[PDB]
Ligand binder design. Structure first.
Ligand SMILES: C=C[C@H](C)CCCC(C)(C)O
Length: 149
C-alpha cells in the first residue's frame, strides 16, 4: 500500500525549455515535502529555490482537478500529475505556461533523500524521453541542492 504524502527531495529535473531550469531559474526546485489532502481536494508543496544565488522557501497549495491532475500558481500557471509512484520515488510531469504565454513541459524525479535507486532513475529518463525532452536537457539536482533541510 502506497503513501504519497511526506518528505520528498528532488534528484533530477528535465525541461523542454532550458531557460526555466538553470541557475536561479524558477524551475530549479529543491523539493522538501508534498502533502495530498484528498478530502479537501488540495495538495501542499514545500520547497526551496534560488534567486540571487540565495535559498528562498515556498509553501504552495494546489487544487485537485480532473484525472488526478493538480493546478497550482507558480511562475505562471501549472498543471501537473504524479505520473509514477514507487516506495522510493515519485515522478511528476508538469506543464507550465509562464507570464509571457510560453509553454514548457518538465519532469522531476523525487526521492526520500540523496541515495537514488537506478530503477526509479531509468523510469524518469523514459518518461522524460516520452515527453520529447532530450537527455542533455536533464539537470542533476542533488548535486546543486545546498539549501537547508
Ligand atoms: C519538474 C517538476 C518539479 C519537481 C515540480 C515543479 C513544481 C510544481 C510544478 C508543482 O509547481
Amino acid at each position: 500500500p502506497f503513501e504519497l504524502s511526506g518528505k520528498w527531495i528532488t534528484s533530477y529535473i528535465g525541461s523542454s525549455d532550458l531557460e526555466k531550469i538553470g541557475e536561479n531559474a524558477p524551475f530549479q526546485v529543491f523539493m522538501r515535502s508534498i502533502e495530498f489532502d484528498d478530502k479537501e481536494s488540495k495538495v501542499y508543496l514545500n520547497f526551496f529555490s534560488k534567486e540571487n544565488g540565495i535559498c528562498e522557501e515556498f509553501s504552495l497549495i494546489g487544487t485537485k482537478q480532473e484525472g488526478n491532475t493538480y493546478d497550482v500558481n507558480y511562475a505562471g500557471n501549472n498543471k501537473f500529475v504524479v505520473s509514477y509512484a514507487s516506495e522510493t520515488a515519485l515522478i511528476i510531469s508538469n506543464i507550465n505556461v509562464d507570464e509571457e504565454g510560453d509553454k514548457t513541459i518538465m519532469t522531476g524525479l523525487l526521492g526520500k533523500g540523496t541515495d537514488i535507486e537506478d530503477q526509479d532513475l531509468e523510469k524518469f529518463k523514459e518518461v522524460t524521453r516520452e515527453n520529447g525532452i532530450p537527455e542533455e536537457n536533464i539537470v542533476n539536482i542533488i548535486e546543486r541542492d545546498d539549501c537547508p533541510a
